[PDB]
């Protein structure tokens, strides 16, 4: 009777374990950046599912203990449940990491509205260092982490592209030439909310062209400044 009942319980337990693995994975797959609250709610729901699995796991262990008879298979079934719990723990850790990344993304969005070229350069350097530290800390856990991890790289690239703009060397004409290539309506200094506008042009996609310009502008002022000397002295 114990094995017939055990086979039915084992099939139900395997289905429950697959559902639990899918629930933690879905939360891990979802990326805030941007999205907030629902991802946190999903993590809470996953914990509740894990708690239900633990109660079911406790019942299976008690049934094995009641059956006793030094059965190796009963011990193995408990080990399989433990492996699922470890995977759930890894998923919970991944969810916490995503929330920390989302907070950093929210700060970046606030910085774009705040804008300020001097403020953006200081913010970009601080943001780049924090993003690099977060990527190094993440290790092991579960598969599909790299797909989310890549996002961090994109964010870092975006932060880097923003830093180039932080240069005050570029003028309106210089900005305009860059703007024509870029296609962005926003100018070098258009608004307080300009930082958000900058985000749409991808940093990785567009640091290159921003850089070319940032360089050109910096190059041109060295001359312009030279002319200032000739100008002032002789005039």
């Amino acid at each position: 009777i114990i094995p017939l009942q055990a086979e039915e319980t084992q099939n139900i337990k395997r289905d429950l374990d697959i559902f639990m693995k899918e629930v933690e994975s879905f939360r891990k797959e979802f990326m805030q950046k941007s999205m907030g609250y629902e991802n946190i709610n999903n993590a809470y729901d996953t914990i509740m599912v894990y708690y239900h699995k633990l109660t079911a796991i406790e019942g299976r262990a008690l049934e094995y203990n009641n059956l006793e008879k030094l059965f190796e298979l009963q011990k193995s079934n408990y080990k399989q449940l433990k492996d699922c719990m470890n995977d759930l723990k890894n998923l919970k850790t991944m969810w916490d990491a995503i929330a920390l990344i989302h907070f950093q993304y929210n700060d970046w969005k606030t910085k774009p509205w705040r804008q300020i070229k001097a403020d953006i350069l200081l913010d970009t350097n601080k943001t780049l260092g924090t993003q690099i530290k977060n990527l190094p800390k993440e290790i092991r856990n579960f598969k599909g982490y790299n797909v989310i991890v890549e996002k961090v790289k994109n964010m870092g690239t975006v932060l880097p592209l923003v830093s180039a703009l932080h240069s005050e060397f570029m003028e309106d004409r210089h900005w305009s030439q860059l703007k024509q290539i870029t296609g962005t309506v926003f100018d070098h200094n258009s608004l307080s909310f300009y930082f958000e506008d900058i985000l749409a042009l991808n940093l990785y996609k567009y640091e290159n062209t921003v850089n070319e310009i940032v360089d050109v502008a910096q190059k041109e002022a060295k001359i312009e400044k030279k002319l200032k000397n000739i100008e002032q002295w002789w005039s």
Partner: protein, 109 residues
């Protein structure tokens, strides 16, 4: 983060954030503590709630809740509450640079 005013307020804020962690900050490192506590609370709340989330901070102002949480635990005052129960207590006074290192360590389970 939950701002608290009592060991009773500290504990309430921890219990009210059961899914994550509620950290009760009792007092601070002097030195005009109130305004500094609120300013750190705002940056930690974004690192606590927004960036890491994992953690809401509730700046105990100013009683002895930290000591009460430590007494309950048997395990400035920082009392970490999981489902409202003290699980981790640390004491000391730290500067803002030290707090940034703590943020990297966060978030504990």
């Amino acid at each position: 983060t939950t701002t608290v005013t009592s060991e009773d307020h500290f504990m309430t804020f921890y219990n009210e954030n059961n899914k994550k962690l509620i950290v009760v900050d009792v007092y601070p490192g002097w030195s005009g503590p109130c305004t500094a506590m609120y300013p750190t609370y705002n940056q930690l709340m974004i690192s606590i709630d927004d960036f890491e989330k994992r953690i809401d901070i509730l700046l105990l102002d100013q009683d002895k809740l930290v000591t009460y949480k430590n007494d309950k635990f048997h395990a400035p005052k920082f009392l970490f509450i999981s489902e409202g129960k003290i699980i981790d207590e640390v004491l000391g006074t730290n500067i803002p640079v030290f707090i940034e290192k703590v943020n990297k360590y966060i978030p504990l389970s």
